[PDB]
Symmetry: D3
Subunit: 121 residues, 6 copies
């Protein structure tokens, strides 16, 4: 698993005071990029993203955790699922899934051509 | 038809010298956010993204243009397609589609509740 | 014409909750940079800026549109006028000019020396 | 155990092509802020930082991982140690500690007054 | 006499490896904003900018210093001149003016109405 | 002395509306980096930071001044003390020290090896 936690500050929000969607997309892609690089052990690029759902808003000041997991491997491509959870700090409240999405990354050689990646296990 | 043009500087690239995918996603979402806002004439939020394909890399120093177009409207939701073209500077040089994706946005009232939007004209 | 639209988020504002002036200047220059590159079909640099007027404040959450237009051409230099309009979203309200300014850009060769640009039409 | 992983892109480097020290410090503080927040279950602020050592440089394109661990607890204060490791991509390649530092954070009430935190378990 | 010094890193450059003009403009405005604020002892806004000349390029890795000086005062307005010098590191190396511009700022009350400022001493 | 002034905008704050600690650390390091480069007259890197104390919060909209001063010199290393003062604008209020810290920088040759710096005076 690949994890990244972020406090949500004003600079990452929209005018409503919630985490901007473009920002969550960038963080998820970064997370997928890291998980894919770890598996392929070489340079990778994002080629596709699908089914990204923004289920619940992320308020200013929330702590969110991104978790990326390799779901399947083809030959040079990898599909990574990324989830974003907001973890409440005040006792009582519980963590909830704010967003989730899938990304397909491709490993490439120094020439930039698709390169084979190890199978998953 | 919403349009945004950006010069690609070092700050928006990955370590390969090409436009980082996360930045591409954020710019597209922002494009769709503006297009949806103008059609709904209300506050809008991104609820879904799908079929985002990164066909060709965008080199450092490229001039990129994002074009967002409203494709369909439901009741409170709108599907916007966003394309990203790199517009070569050199005379007679190319001009190609680098990426494209779809986003679904929902208009909401001041209470944050989904609100209906005008029909697709 | 060269156009760019931006939603105004907290990260681009000053402590008053309005678009920071330094940010509008950077966006206008970027717009002029793009319009000039498109005309010259080569690398350009900003050499001068004049008469930038900030007529009305741009509130947090506003949608602004930047429009850059080539106004005159010398030999290697180009003068581009940039306007920034805020486009209200709520029915009733109308668009207003928030700021406007002029920029002079110069095309340069690979050696960094001023290079001739096509005349305007 | 709080963890954050980041790819090192041009935007976070100094003119040498290595991760800028100021960015390292900001990421560590952010790591400690999250770890302290989760333990205190309250709003927290950084009051002190010490013994931050930059042992090895982090090259552009490296994958870095920050790990924050609560080391000791007083009454309202917590000392968190943060380490930053670069995780090589190449097969059989290295894996080293690039930096480490300690931060002291204090939990505060909504009034901004220091509040006690749970004991160290 | 307001002063700000900045190291020029990749994140603030254009694709040529020199300090981006938009960033220069934002830094100058910020310099003038601070100088005007200290003289007016009130909230201030930028209303006009003129005669900004980019005389020499600022290479990646340069140390730049901005100096803002109050030149004249009207009733509620102030004209501040901002200069940007690159301070070479190498022994006996140069030291030159890279850019200069003028900004006009206006002090305003909490209502946002122009307020008078002290005379120029 | 090396000085840098900054207005505190939303983008540099935490969710409490005060200057984020990670940001003050980055600004102090930048300040130390500049002061050290000026003394060594060559490339430098941050190797150590100690005793950074955050004494008082810095509110949104405050003007802060960073002052870096070379305190001692070894052979290739330099210790710089950095202070951050907030300078009130409204008559009556006075400036106060918000934070202070020490940094050790090392000059290096083109090969990246520690290089001797002139003694202090
Ligand atoms: C990545 C790239 C080189 C692939 O080009 P290509 O001609 O499709 O290469 P191939 O046809 O050999 O396909 C390579 C792999 O990617 C997969 N793939 C390519 N396009 C895809 C798409 N849009 N959706 C899903 N998978 C895709 C293929 O299925 C194949 O997987 P496999 O080897 O497991 O079978 C090209 O699409 C590209 O350069 N895109 C831009 C990448 C980028 O700039 N990203 C943003 C910056 S991080
Ligand atoms: C939509 C939301 C506000 C609550 O409503 P909901 O119960 O999820 O959805 P509703 O049943 O109210 O339906 C709202 C509309 O969105 C559509 N919708 C909701 N979830 C969707 C998804 N994952 N994919 C596609 N469309 C979706 C519905 O089909 C409906 O469209 P319609 O009115 O045209 O028929 C909630 O998803 C939300 O707050 N999400 C977070 C948004 C956000 O923070 N985004 C990033 C910040 S910009
Ligand atoms: C800077 C670096 C090359 C020094 O390595 P080194 O093996 O310690 O080198 P040396 O042992 O010759 O020490 C060089 C000097 O640094 C000082 N120094 C080294 N480590 C130190 C530490 N953690 N605390 C204080 N001073 C330290 C030494 O005392 C010596 O000073 P002196 O010449 O005045 O006596 C190495 O630590 C490094 O590359 N660190 C990463 C720097 C970086 O990436 N910073 C962030 C980006 S700006
Ligand atoms: C702590 C603060 C809130 C006021 O309290 P204070 O009078 O300084 O400290 P207190 O006497 O109330 O003690 C609070 C705790 O912090 C600790 N502390 C305070 N100053 C410290 C320092 N410089 N080094 C180490 N610990 C320190 C105390 O030991 C005490 O710990 P304990 O309860 O476990 O025994 C004040 O320092 C503050 O507001 N600082 C600015 C914080 C900030 O803006 N940081 C950056 C933004 S995230
Ligand atoms: C652009 C630059 C090379 C021009 O230098 P120069 O010695 O003035 O070159 P020239 O005298 O040949 O003038 C070139 C053109 O620029 C115009 N120009 C130069 N300085 C100007 C100024 N301050 N105001 C308006 N136009 C100006 C000239 O009129 C001429 O236009 P023309 O060919 O249509 O007649 C030099 O000023 C420079 O490098 N500046 C820094 C650019 C930069 O870093 N910008 C920020 C980063 S994008
Ligand atoms: C100034 C403003 C507040 C409304 O006042 P106004 O009607 O434009 O100007 P006023 O007639 O009230 O005069 C105010 C002062 O500004 C000066 N001024 C206004 N427009 C100016 C311009 N374009 N050029 C030079 N000075 C100008 C006036 O000469 C006067 O100076 P004085 O009192 O010393 O004689 C309005 O221009 C404003 O809100 N602009 C937007 C500011 C902003 O958002 N900037 C970017 C964010 S920091």
């Amino acid at each position: 698993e690949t994890r990244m936690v972020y406090p949500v500050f004003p600079g990452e929000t929209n005018h409503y005071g919630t985490l901007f969607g473009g920002t969550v997309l960038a963080w998820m892609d970064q997370a997928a990029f890291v998980a894919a690089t770890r598996h392929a052990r070489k340079k990778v690029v994002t080629v596709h993203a699908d089914a990204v759902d923004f289920k619940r808003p992320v308020p200013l000041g929330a702590i969110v955790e991104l978790v990326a997991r390799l779901k399947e491997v083809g030959r040079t491509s990898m599909r990574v699922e990324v989830e974003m959870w907001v973890e409440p700090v005040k006792e009582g409240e519980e963590a909830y899934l704010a967003a989730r999405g899938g990304f397909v990354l491709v490993a490439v050689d120094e020439r930039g051509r698709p390169s084979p990646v190890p199978p998953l296990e």
